[PDB]
Design a protein around this ligand. Structure first.
Ligand SMILES: Nc1ncnc2c1ncn2[C@@H]1O[C@H](COP(=O)(O)OC(=O)[C@@H](N)Cc2c[nH]c3ccccc23)[C@@H](O)[C@H]1O
Ligand SMILES: Nc1ncnc2c1ncn2[C@@H]1O[C@H](COP(=O)(O)OC(=O)[C@@H](N)Cc2c[nH]c3ccccc23)[C@@H](O)[C@H]1O
Lengths: 330, 330
């Protein structure tokens, strides 16, 4: 109990600082006293066309980064979404309890639709949050740790679970949403008002965990700041400075107000230099672990096989409970 | 091979003459030389709210009517849609290859949306044809026998299969659509220009297989005809007369032109009387078999268990083929 669920799409060869600090860092803090299911969501990945060889490789490398970021397979369950049929079974049912207008109002859908273009927009891009709701509800999940960009989808998940329970009392757990304050949004280093994301345009403002560390350090030294020459935490008026403090605090464990106090009299050169140095120290051990998990794959394959078995054992019972309440012949 | 697939929704306590003559009659003719999968589609049924006790009972009674209409479990596979997870797995994938505009243009969606009302319209009503495409493609289906009302959905299924195969050559079988000419649409007896359907308003023009036969005979004697006093086959100008000839021909096996020739000099009283008598002879053996399958349920439960096992063995391999082509970790 204190059951928790969270997922990441295997859409690129590396997670970025947004994923690591907005999500996985909180997962690591929760796994020792929460029963945790961490998922690589390859079914969601194909809502955009994906190269098959890359998709398989990136599924593994995403799970590898979980382990390398501190996720403990002795304490948590790591598995691949497509390997547990219950997700799509529950997604079908929950679609029958999701409003069409409700789904069309999701920001992601609109943004994603704009990038793909219309009549090229597919049903899967539209039903995305219904499958996401199924991912969570299948495990009787009590809490979902994510970044801010996932909030609207999880509010749909809660709404749909409540609507289902309205007709079938007590069937699904309504999950609580757990979104950290400081790292809810890590921002792009070149446009500190946009969240760090792979669809940025160029990756000059994007910090990939597995990129050459000297390259990430360069990007950080080039981060956009302001003209004030005052290191002070204020996301609204000082986006780039605040984001750098956020990042350095998150990867070092030093509170911001302590960093800010310790930065009195310093310029932005030292803020960027120190943040770059802290990030390099952060990613070097991650990369070492990921390299070994990739070169010696049997360990990670055993973890995913074990995780799929345990995820199937839990999620299939949820489906049978839901199917029984609906009145399906069993 | 000559693999065939078809389904009926368990949405009422009885099939009607449309279902029996537009679909199941052709199934019976195909099953001896075609490898056939006949499905009770309970996942589709819940795209509209369903009473659970009724839904379970009607799932059984729909499968019972298959057997009572002549479907042979020694030659064909009968099973319940929800009992085979592969259907929802493939539905998710096919949604990723279905256009949003494409789905919104389905007539059923629009009609069904109009009856349910908007913002009360759900995602499942919208994704209905994607799951229907999955039902068919999961079994490498070569031919699909249905009535005319299913044509537009199966053209989507073919379009989506072709689009998928475009990226992943040779993965899915593109099915042919098999829609009979004479019984493509059985029309309501009180409004012979509308197809016989449960959403008619009143059931005075609807012939349920399992209704009291004297009641169905009454409805037929009250069928709307015309003022011509000439028994002649012409669906466009003589809808009610043509529909009655269609029905009597289909349940007796007598060709229409032979019935029409034999009706020279007769009025519509004899057309309705004879059609009512033929329908009573048609439904009485069906009802006898359905009553026994309901009172002694172990036989039908064994048929559905066997069918689900065989359907799972086939459809799960299709899913694994599709998953492999997409590049999912297996
Ligand atoms: N710049 C950023 N700052 C802060 N946090 C960020 C940033 N970018 C990403 N995140 C967080 O990282 C996690 C994974 O993001 P994805 O885009 O893979 O995230 C996604 O695409 C989801 N649909 C995956 C998903 C599928 N099913 C689920 C069930 C529960 C939770 C999540 C899921 C997320 O927590 C996200 O909030
Ligand atoms: N008045 C009529 N005249 C002639 N034929 C008719 C009439 N009314 C119904 N039919 C036919 O009966 C079958 C079942 O209809 P449903 O409404 O259950 O049919 C439905 O609701 C489908 N979505 C079920 C389905 C789900 N998956 C599938 C895959 C293949 C084929 C069918 C399906 C159909 O063949 C239908 O054309």
């Amino acid at each position: 109990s204190r059951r928790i669920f969270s997922g990441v799409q295997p859409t690129s060869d590396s997670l970025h600082l947004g994923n690591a600090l907005g999500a996985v860092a909180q997962w690591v803090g929760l796994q020792d006293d929460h029963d945790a299911f961490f998922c690589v969501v390859d079914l969601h990945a194909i809502t955009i066309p994906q190269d098959p060889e890359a998709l398989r490789r990136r599924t593994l490398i995403t799970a590898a980064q979980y382990l390398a970021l501190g996720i403990d397979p002795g304490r948590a369950t790591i598995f691949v979404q497509s390997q547990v049929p219950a997700h799509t079974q529950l997604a079908w049912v929950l679609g029958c309890f999701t409003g069409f207008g409700q789904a069309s109002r999701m920001t992601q859908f609109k943004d994603k639709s704009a990038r793909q273009g219309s009549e090229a927009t597919t049903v899967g891009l539209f039903t995305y949050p219904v499958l996401q709701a199924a991912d969570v509800l299948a495990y009787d999940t009590e809490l979902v740790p994510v970044g801010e960009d996932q909030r609207q989808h999880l509010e749909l998940a809660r709404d749909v679970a409540q609507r289902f329970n309205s007709r079938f009392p007590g069937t699904l757990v309504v999950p609580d949403v757990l979104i950290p304050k400081m790292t809810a949004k890590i921002y792009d280093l070149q446009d500190p008002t946009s969240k760090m994301s792979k669809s940025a345009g160029t990756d000059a403002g994007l910090i990939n965990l597995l990129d050459d560390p000297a390259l990430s350090a360069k990007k950080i030294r080039s981060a956009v700041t302001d003209s004030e020459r005052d290191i002070r935490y204020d996301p609204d008026v000082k986006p780039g400075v605040s984001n750098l403090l956020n990042i350095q605090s998150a990867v070092t464990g030093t509170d911001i107000d302590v960093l800010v106090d310790g930065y009195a009299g310093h310029g932005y050169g030292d803020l960027k230099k120190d943040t770059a140095e802290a990030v390099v120290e952060f990613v070097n051990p991650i990369q070492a672990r990921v390299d070994e998990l990739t070169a010696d794959p049997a360990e990670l394959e055993a973890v995913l096989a074990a995780g799929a078995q345990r995820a199937h054992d839990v999620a299939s019972k949820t489906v049978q409970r839901v199917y029984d309440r609906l009145g399906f012949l069993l």
